[PDB]
Design a protein around this ligand. Structure first.
Ligand SMILES: NC(=[NH2+])N1CCCCC1
Ligand SMILES: [Ca+2]
Length: 223
């Protein structure tokens, strides 16, 4: 996250870190046994880390649970990033408490102008590299579809939205991928792609979760 603030320990209780020996992507806990992340974060050998603040220090609220199954969306296209969503099942249920909690799926799609919270452990610089050890947060609005399409001609599908600031300076960045965009207490987006980080006229692009609720629910019910 570029241009954000330190969230505070366990203030974003649905945020997970995906670990394969190191943090590589975020995700969101949607019930005690399932996480949703970006398809472009797929790999084998995932451990899900819940209850994290500092990802390099054991602070006492963590739960570390291996994945048993990963399911990339049937129509994910790695060239265009259309349908950039995946589900991860945990080998055992997490223990839910005030610091480790699920986030609700939306019943309706959010409109442009709605303010959302984006979080992650990704790079904090737009030029160069500095990775934080504690969770960072950013408040940002959903942008109109017309502004999003004007920023990225030919690249925005109905399964994407833009959020952030056209003036630059505040955005998600490398290592934030897969993490949550929460608006009015519901999961509306997944950190997906962008051109650089925090550049003028190049806002972040997010997977539009409201289009996937039926697939999520049906997949969980049968796996
Ligand atoms: N919002 C961005 N600029 N991003 C998304 C995360 C990956 C790097 C590009
Ligand atoms: Ca920790």
């Amino acid at each position: 996250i570029v241009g954000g603030y330190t969230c505070g320990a366990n203030t974003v209780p649905y945020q997970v870190s995906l670990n394969s020996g190191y943090h590589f992507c975020g995700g969101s806990l949607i019930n005690s046994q399932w996480v949703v992340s970006a398809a472009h974060c797929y790999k084998s050998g995932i451990q899900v880390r819940l209850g994290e603040d500092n990802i390099n220090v054991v602070e006492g609220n963590e739960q570390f649970i291996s994945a048993s199954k990963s399911i990339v969306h049937p129509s994910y296209n790695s060239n265009t990033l259309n349908n950039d969503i995946m589900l991860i099942k945990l080998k055992s249920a997490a223990s839910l408490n005030s610091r480790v909690a699920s986030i609700s799926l939306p019943t309706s799609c959010a409109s442009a102008g709605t303010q959302c919270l984006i979080s992650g452990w990704g790079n904090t610089k737009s030029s160069g590299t500095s990775y934080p050890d504690v969770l960072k947060c950013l408040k940002a609005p959903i942008l109109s579809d017309s502004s999003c399409k004007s920023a990225y001609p030919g690249q925005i599908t109905s399964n994407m939205f833009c959020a952030g600031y056209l003036e630059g300076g505040k955005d998600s960045c490398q290592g934030d991928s897969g993490g949550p965009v929460v608006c009015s207490g519901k999961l509306q987006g997944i950190v997906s792609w962008g051109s650089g980080c925090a550049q003028k006229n190049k806002p972040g692009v997010y997977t539009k979760v409201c289009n996937y609720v039926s697939w999520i629910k049906q997949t969980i019910a049968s796996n």
